[PDB]
Design a binder for this molecule. Structure first.
Ligand SMILES: Cc1nnc2n1-c1ccccc1N(c1ccc(Cl)cc1)C[C@H]2C
Length: 126
């Protein structure tokens, strides 16, 4: 597998976008808390399948997502509402569970980050 795909889009002037209190919270509180977790690092940028020697990763994962992309989307006011952003977090975790297996180290890492994520979004601003 010789190259990585282009990363997901992080800017789109034409997409409907808003700054909501929930989207501000998702950047300021949720993403920033997660970012500092000991297990965050594999999720801080797109999977580099070339470096990691995973030539099947982008054969299996067709909607890549990561917290670096999310952070850029948030910073670029990409999203209309918090649900759109939440869906990108869910895609990121789901991708990890698809490519890997229960018990794998990376899965344990995603499970811990997901638990945190869910705790933080349990209550959102109005
Ligand atoms: C995310 C994610 N989803 N799948 C993986 N990634 C990774 C991304 C970046 C670096 C390493 C990753 N993995 C990984 C990270 C930490 C440990 Cl202890 C073991 C494996 C494996 C890779 C198959």
């Amino acid at each position: 597998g010789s190259t990585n795909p282009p990363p997901p889009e992080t800017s789109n002037p034409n997409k409907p976008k808003r700054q909501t209190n929930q989207l501000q919270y998702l950047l300021r509180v949720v993403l920033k808390t997660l970012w500092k977790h000991q297990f965050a690092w594999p999720f801080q940028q797109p999977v580099d399948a070339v470096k990691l020697n995973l030539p099947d990763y982008y054969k299996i994962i067709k909607t890549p997502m990561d917290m670096g992309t999310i952070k850029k989307r948030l910073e670029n006011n990409y999203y209309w509402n918090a649900q759109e952003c939440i869906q990108d977090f869910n895609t990121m975790f789901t991708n990890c569970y698809i490519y890997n297996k229960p018990g794998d180290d990376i899965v344990l890492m995603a499970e811990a980050l997901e638990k945190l994520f869910l705790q933080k979004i349990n209550e959102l601003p109005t």
